[PDB]
Protein backbone atom coordinates (compact mmCIF):
# COMPACT_ATOMS: atom_id res chain seq x y z
CA UNK A 1 0.00 0.00 0.00
CA UNK A 2 1.53 3.84 1.09
CA UNK A 3 4.60 1.60 2.39
CA UNK A 4 5.30 1.30 -1.43
CA UNK A 5 5.87 4.83 -2.17
CA UNK A 6 9.46 4.94 0.44
CA UNK A 7 13.33 4.43 0.13
CA UNK A 8 15.30 2.42 3.29
CA UNK A 9 18.14 4.37 4.24
CA UNK A 10 20.47 3.49 7.30
CA UNK A 11 21.48 5.52 10.20
CA UNK A 12 24.56 4.59 12.24
CA UNK A 13 24.05 5.77 16.22
CA UNK A 14 27.69 6.18 17.77
CA UNK A 15 28.01 5.66 21.37
CA UNK A 16 31.30 6.85 23.37
CA UNK A 17 31.73 6.52 27.43
CA UNK A 18 34.31 6.83 29.44
CA UNK A 19 34.76 7.02 33.64
CA UNK A 20 35.05 10.04 35.26
CA UNK A 21 37.23 9.47 38.24
CA UNK A 22 36.36 13.10 39.69
CA UNK A 23 32.82 12.01 40.38
CA UNK A 24 32.03 10.37 43.25
CA UNK A 25 31.12 6.57 42.42
CA UNK A 26 27.14 6.03 43.05
CA UNK A 27 26.80 2.72 45.36
CA UNK A 28 30.59 2.10 44.48
CA UNK A 29 29.14 2.27 40.75
CA UNK A 30 31.53 4.80 39.11
CA UNK A 31 29.85 7.71 37.39
CA UNK A 32 30.92 7.99 33.46
CA UNK A 33 30.39 10.49 30.77
CA UNK A 34 28.89 9.10 27.74
CA UNK A 35 28.10 10.26 24.12
CA UNK A 36 25.34 9.53 21.38
CA UNK A 37 25.97 10.97 17.42
CA UNK A 38 24.13 10.08 14.67
CA UNK A 39 25.01 9.77 11.06
CA UNK A 40 23.60 8.57 7.89
CA UNK A 41 25.18 5.64 5.70
CA UNK A 42 25.51 5.69 2.31
CA UNK A 43 24.73 2.90 -0.40
CA UNK A 44 28.59 2.67 -0.62
CA UNK A 45 28.42 2.66 3.34
CA UNK A 46 30.38 5.53 4.05
CA UNK A 47 29.00 8.10 6.94
CA UNK A 48 27.78 11.07 6.05
CA UNK A 49 25.81 13.82 7.52
CA UNK A 50 22.20 13.38 8.71
CA UNK A 51 20.56 16.34 7.01
CA UNK A 52 17.81 14.34 5.79
CA UNK A 53 16.47 14.85 9.94
CA UNK A 54 15.71 18.68 11.15
CA UNK A 55 15.45 17.36 14.60
CA UNK A 56 16.28 14.53 16.84
CA UNK A 57 14.97 13.99 20.72
CA UNK A 58 16.84 12.02 22.90
CA UNK A 59 14.62 10.99 25.61
CA UNK A 60 15.99 9.86 28.69
CA UNK A 61 15.29 7.78 32.04
CA UNK A 62 13.17 9.54 34.65
CA UNK A 63 16.23 10.22 36.29
CA UNK A 64 18.17 12.84 34.43
CA UNK A 65 17.01 16.75 34.48
CA UNK A 66 15.36 17.59 31.36
CA UNK A 67 15.20 14.26 30.20
CA UNK A 68 13.99 14.96 26.96
CA UNK A 69 17.06 16.61 24.72
CA UNK A 70 16.17 18.28 21.36
CA UNK A 71 19.34 18.77 18.81
CA UNK A 72 18.93 19.89 15.53
CA UNK A 73 22.40 20.29 13.88
CA UNK A 74 24.27 17.03 12.51
CA UNK A 75 25.56 15.27 14.05
CA UNK A 76 22.97 15.76 16.81
CA UNK A 77 25.33 14.98 19.32
CA UNK A 78 24.40 14.41 22.95
CA UNK A 79 26.89 14.45 26.43
CA UNK A 80 25.54 13.05 29.87
CA UNK A 81 26.61 11.83 32.74
CA UNK A 82 25.44 8.83 34.55
CA UNK A 83 26.10 5.30 35.99
CA UNK A 84 24.25 3.06 35.43
CA UNK A 85 23.27 2.00 31.30
CA UNK A 86 19.70 2.26 30.27
CA UNK A 87 17.60 2.20 27.12
CA UNK A 88 16.55 5.61 25.77
CA UNK A 89 14.41 6.50 23.29
CA UNK A 90 15.79 8.33 20.18
CA UNK A 91 13.16 10.45 18.24
CA UNK A 92 14.27 11.10 14.51
CA UNK A 93 11.99 13.96 12.69
CA UNK A 94 12.51 13.63 8.89
CA UNK A 95 12.42 17.04 6.97
CA UNK A 96 9.14 18.81 6.15
CA UNK A 97 7.15 17.40 8.66
CA UNK A 98 7.44 14.09 6.67
CA UNK A 99 7.16 11.43 10.36
CA UNK A 100 8.54 10.85 14.00
CA UNK A 101 10.54 7.73 13.74
CA UNK A 102 11.50 6.23 17.69
CA UNK A 103 14.23 4.08 18.15
CA UNK A 104 14.91 2.68 21.26
CA UNK A 105 18.72 2.77 22.35
CA UNK A 106 21.02 0.72 24.84
CA UNK A 107 22.82 3.08 26.39
CA UNK A 108 25.77 0.60 27.87
CA UNK A 109 29.23 0.68 29.76
CA UNK A 110 30.71 -2.99 27.99
CA UNK A 111 33.01 -1.30 25.44
CA UNK A 112 34.51 1.96 25.27
CA UNK A 113 32.92 2.54 22.30
CA UNK A 114 29.97 0.96 19.85
CA UNK A 115 28.14 1.19 16.53
CA UNK A 116 24.41 0.20 16.24
CA UNK A 117 22.80 0.97 12.85
CA UNK A 118 18.67 0.80 11.91
CA UNK A 119 17.22 0.99 8.90
CA UNK A 120 14.38 3.59 8.56
CA UNK A 121 11.60 3.91 5.77
CA UNK A 122 11.17 7.55 4.03
CA UNK A 123 8.37 9.01 2.49
CA UNK A 124 9.29 10.29 -1.42
CA UNK A 125 6.58 12.73 -1.06
CA UNK A 126 8.36 15.57 -0.10
CA UNK A 127 10.09 17.30 -2.45
CA UNK A 128 12.66 19.12 -0.01
CA UNK A 129 13.49 15.84 1.77
CA UNK A 130 13.38 13.82 -1.92
CA UNK A 131 16.41 16.24 -2.96
CA UNK A 132 18.15 15.35 0.33
CA UNK A 133 17.84 11.96 0.47
CA UNK A 134 19.00 11.95 -3.45
CA UNK A 135 22.79 12.66 -1.09
CA UNK A 136 23.03 9.00 0.27
CA UNK A 137 21.62 6.87 -2.56
CA UNK A 138 19.11 6.48 -5.19
CA UNK A 139 15.36 7.55 -5.09
Same mark, same amino acid.
Given at each position: ??????? %????? #? $???????? /?????? &?????????????????? %? /???????? $????????????????????? +?? #? /????? @????????? +???? %? @???? %?????? &????????? /???????? &? $????????? $?????
Amino acid at each position: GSMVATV %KRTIR #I $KTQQHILP /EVPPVE &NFPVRQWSIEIVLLDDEG %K /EIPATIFD $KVIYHLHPTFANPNRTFTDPP +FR #I /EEQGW @AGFPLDISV +FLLE %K @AGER %KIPHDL &NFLQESYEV /EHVIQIPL &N $KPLLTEELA $KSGST
